[PDB]
Symmetry: D2
Subunit: 253 residues, 4 copies
């Protein structure tokens, strides 16, 4: 199989990039960063973020792997002392792959991103929430956050959103300081949506701050923002059982 | 073919009681093996009807008229005789299995809640055989997807579309203070995940399953999981959950 | 004049007489009838039912609280030795609970006060200075003193208030908040002379709780909270940094 | 209310732009601007209302307010609130009450609300609502990351007269601070200081806070 490695960029990660590279040169594994069927990030979820987004249009046949140098996070499954084991288990092609859902933002011709964590909207902020073409509330406040299961441990969590197991195929909207009065009556609860439900947020300025994962692009004169579970998923090469609730224990308790 | 009807028993469900029985007079009644169980009175009625025919859940398609589970207005009660009259495809909602050890098994359609008597409520939460937290507070609520709009909402949970096969635990008035630190956040578990509540000091709790809230001495494990069974709804129109979320909580402009 | 109260355990009984061994000198005498200093041994729960012994001699008694391993007690066991010597005044507010039927009972409270059902739905109406404010269907209501905000009030989502501040704090418990029973959701801090009143609508329910004592009442006509004219007095030797003891109890 | 402007100051003493009365237009929003005398309002929580007014034109009644202090030191008064947030990346700040550390807050930011300012933003961040007369101030948290590292108090915090919360940086040195509606960034802030000002605001009165709250939210 072909492969490529990204680095956090500190000397110890680059140092393990090159060692892993020379580790792989002995097996039937070639190095490719334009068409890799295996992608490695060194340095944690924030860097894992960039790898994911560096190969969005070949997400379909890439098998991601992550190494994190300190604590574990939620995307890295691996310690750098354990690279040596990884290099030979990967060569042997001894890995099962796992699908996590993604969240498609649509802007309105139109723009259209992917999101492994979340996606937010700000910029006096007043937007009409429309679920499956049927109005649901009129929201005044800071913003809204649509987040993926994998994203529920992140800004989701800090907004009162629930922690979801990544395998569940869903999205979840949470408010950001909703005023919630007579005029602008909002649910308060977070809203956990399934595949094929579309939430469309529609204006009442039209120039919002729209951040996909971390990239915030300010958009101009927006006629609609539309969120939904994406048909594309993301695949992790896995060698051992993952324990989501453990890592939630570990990060927070 | 066959059918029956639960009634709240109030003086509104009771005109419609036989007014639908006599209505069906030209298209017969079972109270023991019906193919249909029709609820008249509200959501708590529907539940008692669920807990009365939970045994036969495999061949039943439930339906309900209100005077989140009733999709029918009393003025349409005869266009419902006409719609059942011919014969719809069912849509199904997951349920929450509940095991008690000392082994007593129960399904719920909304929630299951654990509290203690007097004496503080402290219980070890254990997920997939592994310790996750030691929680102190008023109690803990595990809700089904349909149940999220119920108690779970007032607790601080998310609302979930009932197609999603999951369950949801939420915290009741937890103490967080360097002795006891809880997640706080609500937690959505998929199928095949097992959340088990194991006792600490006091070992006699109050365990509710939907509306039937019973007391238990002797307890040494309480074990939530999502069931392999489901409840089926009979529908001729059909349903927009968020539409109903919007009606109960935001506005009902008509 | 002095007194002490004890927890019941060996350790608490241990030092009660030791301090009365140090007090038998000096110009001070014991009478658990007319004391003006009352000393808790054993923590904050034990402090609570001591107070509840001397309510009618409140505005006249000092309280110091002795402690094992807290928000009311400001001394540990080792430190009893010098305490005897220089015992040889600060206020925190209270909250009167009034119930009506068919005659009225009343209860001062140092932490909070909670309403519940006796079985079914708790469905109540919140009338504030005789002007309806919301209708509540949930589990119950909590109204806390400031000195009680670190208690059950903290868990329900209430604000932490410094105790000098003269207020009360209504918080909800699992309100349905739908379009029928719409609630503010937020905590609400009522000041002196504001009367908050809990009328029922259907069933005449109510398992009430004051601090820790949960007494049933059947057919209650009406319930009323308001900031206390009486006040509880603490004998103090140092300066108090409530915010530091909030750090300790809750942040690691 | 350009139309209601000189409308009935034609109906009426005098007028000059050191007033003894400043009347507010069309609601709470730009009463905040008029903010920076007995004040009164008519709205198209602060404007308790026009002919019968100058007809009646009074008791003056007290609402408290908030001092901000950034460090020459500049200071900013507040009718509603004051907030600190980071310019780009991780907002990380240390909370020092009464000259003694309390917690290290990481996330979006923090919000010091006045008693009258509790029905505003503070409400939406989870603050309590206080009848303004209560001599106090309140801090509420914005979107904390509460884990192993940055353990925070969670609850909103209410402080009285003379108590001082001081917010101090840990990594980067600028934050977008702002008070009431203005939005004035600051680089090179080493301390941010919230304390009830000795100040007071007087209202010209001829309320039922709990009913205005009722009418706005219920």
């Amino acid at each position: 199989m072909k492969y490529m490695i990204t680095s956090k960029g500190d000397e110890k990660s680059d140092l393990l990039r090159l060692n892993m590279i020379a580790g792989f040169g002995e097996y039937d594994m070639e190095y490719d960063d334009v068409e890799p069927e295996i992608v490695i990030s060194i340095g944690g979820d924030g860097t894992f973020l960039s790898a994911f987004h560096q190969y969005e249009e070949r997400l379909d046949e890439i098998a991601f792997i992550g190494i994190h140098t300190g604590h574990l996070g939620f995307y890295a499954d691996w310690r750098p002392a354990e690279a040596d084991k990884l290099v030979k288990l990967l060569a042997k092609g001894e890995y099962q792959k796992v699908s996590y859902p993604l969240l498609k933002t649509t802007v309105k011709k139109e723009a259209t991103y992917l999101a492994l964590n979340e996606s937010t909207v700000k910029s006096p902020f007043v937007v009409d929430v429309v679920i499956n073409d049927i109005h649901f509330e009129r929201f005044r406040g800071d913003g809204l956050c649509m987040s993926t299961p994998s994203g529920t441990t992140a800004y989701n969590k800090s907004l009162g959103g629930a922690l979801m197991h990544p395998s569940i195929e869903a999205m979840q909207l949470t408010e950001m300081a909703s005023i919630n009065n007579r005029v602008y009556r909002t649910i308060g609860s977070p809203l956990v949506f399934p595949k094929h439900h579309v939430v469309s947020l529609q204006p009442v300025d039209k120039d919002f701050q729209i951040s996909v994962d971390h990239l915030s692009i300010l958009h101009r004169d927006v006629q609609e923002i539309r969120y939904e579970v994406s048909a594309k998923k993301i695949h992790f090469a896995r060698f051992r059982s993952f324990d989501f609730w453990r890592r939630v224990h570990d990060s927070f308790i």
